[PDB]
Ligand binder design. Structure first.
Ligand SMILES: C=CC1=C(C)/C(=C/c2[nH]c(/C=C3N=C(/C=C4\NC(=O)C(C)=C4C=C)C(C)=C\3CCC(=O)O)c(CCC(=O)O)c2C)NC1=O
Length: 233
């Protein structure tokens, strides 16, 4: 809970330091409170220089659930990976699900070579963070060097905090190193590929059940298709 808050504030502080400013969300999607769960989900959009979209979501459902999630979409003139962060803590089962990746637009060797030196290094530094995916395809819109942990309190408390900060710093470094460097994928196709990221991710959505339980079918669907993965229908 406090750990997840610190991630949100670091990200928001970083965004602010970098000249980012808040953007309005579709009405009703910025906050939803569970009529049953005592669960609260809050979301943000940012105008971050170099990025055409940047969303953040924080779900506070006490000891039942904590979530911190964020996706960064670079401006179309950058073909570099998206940032994807999906962190869940299930208090009843003392269960951590932590996924952090630089989600690649393509799997081409040259593209992976170009962008992944930092993530490769992070992956080596935080080995406690082997897991198999049951919904997503590890070869579509994920890299080989993602941090993917299904674990417990030790991982959540001891490794995740420093790993998140390192991951975030490595993502900014990635973006900054891409400034003024030729993109190999041009803007029209970066757009197609980012939109197809939304389409893919909405198709494989592992969260609809959790969302529906807390917030109802209608809100969950709006949230998925209007905020999470806006190019999806
Ligand atoms: C507020 C938004 C949001 C929430 C709360 C969320 C929840 C959510 N994400 C999950 C899995 C997952 N989530 C990810 C990864 C990601 N998923 C992403 O949305 C992004 C950007 C990444 C980036 C790395 C992966 C790899 C899994 C495992 C699913 C699988 O087994 O295929 C799961 C299943 C837990 C499990 O695998 O045991 C839940 C309930 N997903 C969301 O999008």
């Amino acid at each position: 809970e406090f750990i997840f808050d610190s991630f949100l504030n670091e990200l928001h502080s970083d965004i602010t330091k970098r000249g980012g400013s808040p953007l309005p969300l579709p009405e009703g999607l910025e906050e939803c409170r569970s009529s049953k769960s005592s669960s609260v989900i809050q979301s943000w959009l940012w105008d971050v220089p170099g990025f055409r979209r940047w969303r953040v979501t924080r779900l506070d459902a006490g000891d039942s659930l904590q979530v911190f999630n964020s996706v960064a979409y670079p401006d179309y003139n950058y073909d570099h990976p998206l940032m994807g962060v999906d962190l869940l803590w299930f208090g009843a089962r003392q269960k951590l699900v932590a996924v952090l990746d630089f989600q690649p637009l393509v799997q081409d060797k040259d593209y992976l070579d170009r962008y992944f030196s930092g993530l490769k290094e992070l992956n080596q530094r935080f080995p406690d963070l082997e897991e198999t995916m049951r919904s997503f395809d590890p070869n579509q819109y994920f890299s080989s060097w993602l941090l993917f942990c299904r674990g417990g309190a030790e991982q959540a408390d001891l490794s995740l905090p420093k790993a998140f900060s390192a991951f975030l710093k490595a993502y900014w470094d990635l973006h900054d190193n891409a400034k003024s460097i030729p993109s190999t994928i041009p803007p029209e196709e970066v757009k197609n590929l980012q939109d197809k990221y939304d389409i893919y991710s909405a198709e494989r959505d592992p969260a609809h059940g959790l969302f529906t339980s807390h917030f109802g079918k209608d809100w969950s669907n709006r949230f998925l298709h209007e905020f999470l993965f806006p190019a999806s229908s």
